[PDB]
Amino acid sequence: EFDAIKIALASPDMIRSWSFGEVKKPETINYRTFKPERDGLFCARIFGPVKDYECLCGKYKRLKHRGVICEKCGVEVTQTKVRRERMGHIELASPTAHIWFLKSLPSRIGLLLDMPLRDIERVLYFESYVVIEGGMTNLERQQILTEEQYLDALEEFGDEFDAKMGAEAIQALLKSMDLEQECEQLREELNETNSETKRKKLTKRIKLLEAFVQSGNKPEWMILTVLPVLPPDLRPLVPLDGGRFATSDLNDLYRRVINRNNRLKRLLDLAAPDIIVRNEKRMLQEAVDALLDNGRRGRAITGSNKRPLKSLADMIKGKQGRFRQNLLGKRVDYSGRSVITVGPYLRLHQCGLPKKMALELFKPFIYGKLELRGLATTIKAAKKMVEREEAVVWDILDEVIREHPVLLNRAPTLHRLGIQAFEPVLIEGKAIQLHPLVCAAYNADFDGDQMAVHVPLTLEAQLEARALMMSTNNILSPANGEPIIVPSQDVVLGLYYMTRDCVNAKGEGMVLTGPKEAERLYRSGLASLHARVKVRITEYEKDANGELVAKTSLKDTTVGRAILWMIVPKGLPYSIVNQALGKKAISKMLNTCYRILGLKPTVIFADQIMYTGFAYAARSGASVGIDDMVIPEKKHEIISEAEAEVAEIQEQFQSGLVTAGERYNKVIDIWAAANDRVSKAMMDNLQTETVINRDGQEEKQVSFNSIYMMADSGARGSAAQIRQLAGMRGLMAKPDGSIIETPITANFREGLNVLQYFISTHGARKGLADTALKTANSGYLTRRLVDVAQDLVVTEDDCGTHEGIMMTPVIEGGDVKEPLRDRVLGRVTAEDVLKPGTADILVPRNTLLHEQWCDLLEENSVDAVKVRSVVSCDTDFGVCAHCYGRDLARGHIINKGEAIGVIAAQSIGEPGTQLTMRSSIQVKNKGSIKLSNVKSVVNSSGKLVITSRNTELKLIDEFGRTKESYKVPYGAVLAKGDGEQVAGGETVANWDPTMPVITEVSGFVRFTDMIDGQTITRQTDELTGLSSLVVLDSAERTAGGKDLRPALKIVDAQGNDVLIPGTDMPAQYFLPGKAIVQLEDGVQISSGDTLARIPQTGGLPRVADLFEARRPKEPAILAEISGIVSFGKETKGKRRLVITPVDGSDPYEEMIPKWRQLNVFEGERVERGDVISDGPEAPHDILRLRGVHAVTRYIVNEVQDVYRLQGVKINDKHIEVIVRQMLRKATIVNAGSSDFLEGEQVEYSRVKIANRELEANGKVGATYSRDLLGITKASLATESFISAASFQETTRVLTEAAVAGKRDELRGLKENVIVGRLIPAGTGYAYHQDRMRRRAA
C-alpha cells in the first residue's frame, strides 16, 4: 500500500486534524456504574462507540442508524475497532519544550543555540530569566538574567526592557530568529577558520540548520504546545473486583497532566498574580516531562509503590519494547517438534510423518475436506468424528497430503540449507523419517537431535515452496561449488565394494553381451561380484548438438562396473567408472552429469546410486574384527631402537655435554622419526596384504581388509585414525601447548598404562572444551556480518562499468595451491580476452565464463584476466548482474532480485564450527627465472646483487605460465639471471636470516664525516680480533658526537668524495645504528660490495579482527610519498624522520620509533606507496594511498588462506561483497555541496556529483576520498534510521530523523521486516516491481 516513509515534526493545526475532539476531565469512569464519562479522558464521543453499532445511550440499534451520530451521545453509531485507532488531543495553556531534544546528549536545543542547557533547564523551570533584547545598547538576545538584575534593568531602561519566562519565551526566541543569515555567516566563518576543536561543532551545526531549513519543519513546532492523546485500547484498564481498575501508567500520567492543565486553567480564570503562575507552570512542566519521559530527568514516579512506571520509553526502549523481539523471534502455530530416524527407501523429494502429527497438523484442512464432501454437518460433528478416527479420515487426509509440502529445519539453522521442503508421505511410528542423502545438508546426526516441522498456508506459499525449497532444486553448494547431495556416509562403501578387481574368482575371463545379463551371472551366484570379464556396452555422447549418437565397443572391465553402468544415465563416457570408485570421484561424477544432462537426470541418478549402494553394501557384508586390523610385528622392535637411542641422548645430558632444551628437541625429533617409520611400516603391511595366486605362482594385489576399504574409500576415518588403531598413537602435548617428552608407545588394540591414558586425557579435554565454548562466540559473529550486508539486493542488470584489475591465481611461494580456472569460474568478464597470440581474441567481453571459455583457456596458456567485481560496480544502492557474476545456487547467471548479502553472510559464517579458536631459496620446478622490481647490480664476483629491499623473483613456465614466486630480501646475491632456463632443485639467491648494506660505487673507503669513538666506536672485539666500525645511535653512542648523521665517504683513487655522475649525490652513505663494518681504513671496495651488517593467530580471532579492521600492535609504516627519503631529527621521544620528495610537498616528516628496526636509509629512492617498516599493516593506509583494489585482494587473500589452512573452500564472491558494503563511507576533499569534510555515504556523493556534472557543468562539485569503517561502525552509521532504532539508542535516532526530515526509502531488508510489510528480496522483489509497474505507472 506504500513504498516509502517520511518522518518529521507536526504542526498544531494538523495535530488537531489528527485529533477528533478535545478532552476536558480525567474521568475515565463513574462510580456505581461502569460507563466512562462522555466528557472524561475515555471520551466515547471522541474515541468512538463503546459497543458495536451502538451509541453510548444505545438509542440507535445496529440496523437503522449505522455509521451516523446520535442525538444524545455525539458518537457515530459504528463498529468498535475504530476505537482501537481513534484518538484526540489536549490543548496546553502554556507551551512546553519537548524534553528529548533537552535530554539527548547532543542536545538539539543547545546545539541550535550553541549555548549550554544547564541554564536552559533553570529558565525552563523559572529559576533564571531569559532576555529578549532587554536593552538596545547593553546586552544581547541570548543572555540569562536574574530577577534582581531584571529589577535593575527595569529601573535602568524599563521602556525598552522586556524579558519573558520559560519555554514560551524560548519558543518566542526561536520563532523570532531565522536560520538563513545563520547559514551564510557560518559558511563564511568555516571558509576562513583555523580552529579544529570548534570546527567539528560548527560543521555539525551548519549541517543541521541547512538540513532543517530544507526540511520545512519549524523550531516552534519542536517546542510542542498541543499534546496528542493515545487511543485507550493500548492502555489496559479492566474493571477489577470491587470497582477497581488495572491502573495503567499511561492513565496515571494522563490524569496528572490533565489535572495540572485544569489547575492552570482555574489559575488563569481570575487573573491570578504571577507569584503562583510560576509555581503551576513549573509543576505542569514537570508533569509533561514525566508523562513524556519519566526516570530520565526527575525520576518523579509519584504514581506507584516506589517503582518505575511505563511512561513512554517502556513501549519503545527496553527489551519490553516490542519492535525487535515481537517482530524478531517468537512462537508460532501449525508446527511440531520430534525426533528423526533413517528412511532408506524414499525418493529424494519425499519425507515421512507419523500419523498423529499428520492429523494434528492438518485437522483444519480436514474439517474443510469433510464438510466439502458433506459427510460432516457441523464443526462440532467434524471435530468429534475426526477425533474418533473414522475410516474416511485416513484416505481423505492422504488425498490432501499429496500436494502440500512441509518445511523441515534443524535447531541451529546455520545457512540456507537449514530449511527445506518435502511432500509428506504418511507412515506409522512417532518419528520423522528423512531421506539419508539430504541428511548431510542439515549436519543432523541421528544421535537423537530434534527437528521441527512447519507448514505453509496460502497458495502463494505452497507454490513458492514447490518452486524453491524442494530438495531437488537446492542441490549445489550455496557456499562454493558442489552438490550437497554428495553420496552420504554408507552408500560410498557400497559403491567401493561394487567396483574392485580380484586377481581370480568364480566366473572370470569370459565375455558378456551387455550389462543386462551381467547381473544375471551374479544373481545366480555363478560369477564373482568383481572379476576380469570383457563386456560390450552402448552409450551416447552429447557431441551432436541436441542429439546423443550411440556407439559401442568391447571394453575390459569388471562385473560390478557393468552393474553400475546399468543405472548410469545416457550421455556419459564409460571411462569415468572404469576405476575403483571413491568418495571424491563419485562426487565429481555428479558434477559432470549436472554439467551435461541437467537436473532431473542427475537427481534420478542420485536416487539410483543410493539404492544400489545400500543393496550391495548389505549384500556384501563387512564387519570389523579383532583380527581384521593387524599390528606390524616390527613396530615394537622398531621403537625399541628408538627407546635405546633416547637413553643415549640421556647420557649426553647425563654427562652434562648437552642441555635439556637441545636434548628436548633431540628426543622429540627422534620420537617423531620413529613414529613415521612405524606408520609407514604398518601402512605398507595393510595396503598390500592380499597375495592370491592366479594359475600357479603367487602374486600380490590390493588388500581386502575391511578397515582398508572403510578408510581408503574415504567414507570414514583418515590416515591418523588408522595409525592410532594399530601403530604408534603418537606423542601428545602437555596442556600449556608444549609437547611432553614421552610418546604413548602403546596403541589401542594393545594394552595401555594408566599414566599414558591419564596423560592423553587432557589432550581430548582441551579440544572438547574448545568445541563446547565455540558454539556461542562464532554464532554471534554471523550477526555482525548480516547487519552490514543486510540488503545488497541486485536491482539492475548492467550499469556498463568495465573496471577491475587482473584477477589472477595467487602463487604461494612453492606450488600454486589454486588455479585460475576455478577462481574466475562463475565470473563475468569485464575486459575482452586477448589470447597470447598477437590480437587473436578468444573470448569476447561481456560474456559469462562458465565452462566453455574456461575450457578455452588451458590450451591457450591464458594466466591473467580480469572480471567485473561488485566493488567496481557504480550503481545506486544495488549491484549489476553483469557486474556480480554467476550465482552458485543454479548454473545460470544470477536472476534479478535474489538477495546476496544474507547468502554471503551465512556462507561466510557456516564453517565457524570447524573454525578452531586457539637465507637462500631453492627452486623446485623447471622454468626461466623472472624478477619483478628489477634493481640489481653486477657484484665483484660477476654475479648480480640486489639493492632494492622489495625485490621479488618468480619462475615462469615455458608456456608463459607463472609457476613460482619468491621474495628477495635486500642485499641478496643472485646465483643466476633472468630468463635463464633452470630446472628445479637449484638455489639462485642467497642471503642471511641480520641484514647487509652494500655500496653502489667502487673505490677506496676514506672514512670521513664520522667522529672516531663518538659516532663510530672502534670496537676491537676479541672474537673478530680487529678494530671494526660500529655506528651506534644517538642513545647508544655519545649524543654530542651523534649530531651530524655520519656518512662514510667512499672515494676513488684520487681521494675525493666520488659522486654518482651528475645524477643524484656523492658516495656519502648515511650509516644507520649498529652499522657493523669490519674494515678499518682506506681499503678498496668495488661497486656492489658489502659495507655493513646490521645485527637485526587463531582462526576465529583473526577473522573477527580482520573484519573489524582494528589496527595491529605494530603497523608496518609505509612511505606514503615518492621522491628520495631523508632522515629527520631526534626529539624527546621517537626519532623524527623527514622526507625529500623530488617534487610536490617537499617538507614531509613523521614520528618514527627508533627501538624497532627501520630498514630504510638515505639512498632509498622512495616511490608511490612503498612500505617503510615491516610487519602487520592496517587496512586504513592501504585504502587511502594505494587504491581500493589493493585491499580487495588483501582481505580475501588472508581469509581464504586461513580457510585453506583449515581445509575449507568458499568462492571469493561471498567474502568480498561485504567489502563493497564495508567500504560504504567517504570524506570530502574539495567543497561545493557539503560543508568541508563530513564523512558520509560515498555512493551518495558519487550520485550527487555525477548528476551535477551534466547540470552544473564545470563545477568541481566534491573531490573526495573513499575511506573504510568497521562492520560494527558500519552498522551504527546506516542510512536507514529504522535499522538503528531496531536495536540501539532509539531515543536519538527518532530525534535527528524527525528534525532532519528523514525520508526512508526502505532500500534495506531489516527495515522492511520491522514494520511488517513484505520483504522486497525474493518473490517480494518481483511483487513490488510489478506493483510499481502497474499501479502509479
Partner: peptide, 28 residues
C-alpha cells in the same frame, strides 16, 4: 506430482514471475 521446475528455469527462467503468475492463476 511435479517437483522440478527446471523446464521453466531454462525457458522462461525467473523464480518469482512464474510462481507469482501461478499464484494468481490458482487463486481462481
Amino acid at each position: 506430482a511435479r517437483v522440478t521446475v527446471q523446464d521453466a528455469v531454462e525457458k522462461i527462467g525467473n523464480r518469482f514471475d512464474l510462481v507469482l503468475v501461478a499464484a494468481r492463476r490458482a487463486r481462481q
